[PDB]
Structure 1
C-alpha cells in the first residue's frame, strides 16, 4: 500500500474490468494514476470513483490516434512531472466469424490497428518520456492467445496477441539500454463482463464453464489476479524482470487433455 508510493502510472483500456481493477490496486498501493479510453467510461464512478480526484484522473484517448496518445502522455507529465508505469490494456475481439472461410478482411484490419498499432503508439509515447529519465516499466495485456490457438478464437485476435508478445520482446531488447523494462501478462478467461455465446452468455455460467475446463480447481481467475500480476511487473520488486510473458492461466496451456479424456469417457 506504499509498494508503488508516488509512482505515476497511465492505464489505457480502463473501462473494461482489468483496467478498472488495476487502477484501484495501484491507488491502494500509493500511485497516482491517469485512466484513458475513448468510451469516456461507464458513467463517472469508474475512473473518478476508483480513487479520489487527487490520485486518479480520466483522459479521453483513442489509442489508434497518435495525437490522442501524445496528448495522454504529455498531459500526464504536465500533471505529475514524470511517468513511471505504462499499462497498455487495449484489446478488441473479432466482429466476424471464426473460420477462415468467413473471417472479415476489414475486421482483420480493424483489430490489427487497435490491438497492435495502438500498443505500438502507447509504448512509443511512453518511451519518449521514459528514455530521458532512464526509468520505466511498460506492461502490455496480451492473452494465452499470444502463444496458443483456440477453436472459436479468431485468427486476427491470436495473430495480434502474438504481435503484442513480439512488441514486448523487441521493445525489451531496445529499452534495456536505458534501464526500462517491458513485459506482458497473458490471461486465461477472466471472469466478467459477460461475453457472448448463443448459449449461456452469462458471467456466472461462463465462470463455471471456465472452472470446468480449468487446470487449477477451487478458484476462478479474476481481474484482481491479473491486476496483481501487473502490479508485480510495474513496481520495484520486479526490477530485473524484462521480456517476460507472465502467463496467468492456472496451468491451462501446459497440456492438451483431449487424448487422456478420449480414453477416459470418450470411447
Structure 2
C-alpha cells in the first residue's frame, strides 16, 4: 500500500514544461494519473516531451505553444485549460547583469515574466478551484529568493515580489481547499544549466568538468539536483495529503543556502 496522492483524473496546467524543472513536474503529475496541459514557446520540443509523457503514463497531454507573457498567449493557454485543479507557475529568468545597465523596459519585462504573469494565471483559475473545493498552486521560483545573487537583480526583484504576493493570498484561500506554495530550486542538472555551464567554461578558460566541480564544491550535498526529485516534491504538494500546507517556501538546494530559516 504505497502512498496514494489521490489526484488521479485531476487536471494540471504546467508552464514552461517542455524541458527542465517544468518537465519534471509534468512527468511526476502524469505518473500520478493527472491529465496535463503543458505550455512552452517552441512547438517541436513541446510535442516530443508530450509524446514521451503520454507514452510513459496513461493520461492525456495537451500542448500549447505560445508566449504566456502576452495577453493573447496567456489567453491561448487558458483556453486549452480553463478549469485546472493544479497550476504550476514557471518561467525562465532574465540574463545576469548590472542594474546600472537595465532599462525601465528590462524591469517591466522581468516583472511580467516572473511576477505578473503568474499572478494573472492565478487570478484566472483560482475561483474555479474555490468553487470545486480543491486547488493546488505551485510556483517555481528560486533559492535566490532566500539569498539574492548580485548579478540576478531582475529575477531577485521579480521573484521576491511574487513571493510576497503569494504569502498574503495563500492565507486567504486555504480554508476553501486551495493551497499556494513555492518551490525554490538551487542548482539542478538541466540542459539549460549544462549549456550555460559550457558557456562560462569556454569563457573562463577552464574545462567543462573543472567548472562543474567548482559549482559542486559550493553545494554541501556534493551533487546537482535532478528534475525527477524536484517533480516529486511538486507532486507531494499537489496531493490530498498537503491541504494543511500553504504559503510555504521549500528550499531544494542540497543545503547550499546557509540560513537557519
TM-score of the pair, normalised by structure 1 = 0.82
SS in 2 for 1:216: coil
Whole-angstrom distance in 2 between the partners of 1:55 and 1:224? 20
1:185 maps to: 183
Whole-angstrom distance in 2 between the partners of 1:93 and 1:13? 14
Cα deviation digits, residues 181-203 of structure 1 (max 9, x gap)? 00010011112222142337987
1:87 maps to: 88
- Does residue 244 (structure 1) correspond to residue 248 (structure 2)? The answer is yes
Change in Cα spacing, 1:5 to 1:48, as seen in structure 2 (3 Å) is same
Unpaired segments of 5 or more residues in structure 2?
Answer: none
Aligned residues: 248
1:213 maps to: 218
1:9 maps to: 12
Unpaired segments of 5 or more residues in structure 1?
Answer: 257-267
Q: Is the 8 A contact 1:192 1:203 kept in 2?
A: no
Partner residue of 1:155 out of 142, 153, 156: 153
Partner residue of 1:40 out of 40, 43, 53: 43
SS in 2 for 1:139: strand
Q: Is the 8 A contact 1:83 1:130 kept in 2?
A: yes
Of structures 1 and 2, the one with the larger relative CO (CA 8 A, separation 6+) is: 2
Whole-angstrom distance in 2 between the partners of 1:201 and 1:6? 49
Following superposition, the deviation at residue 29 of structure 1 comes to 1.4
Following superposition, the deviation at residue 22 of structure 1 comes to 1.5
TM-score of the pair, normalised by structure 2 = 0.84
The range that moved more, 246-255 or 35-44, is: 35-44
Q: What's the RMSD between the two structures over aligned residues? A: 2.5
Whole-angstrom distance in 1 between the partners of 2:156 and 2:88? 20
Following superposition, the deviation at residue 249 of structure 1 comes to 1.0
After the TM superposition, list the runs of 4 or more consecutive aligned residues in structure 1 that deviate by more than 4 angstroms. 200-207
1:68 maps to: 73
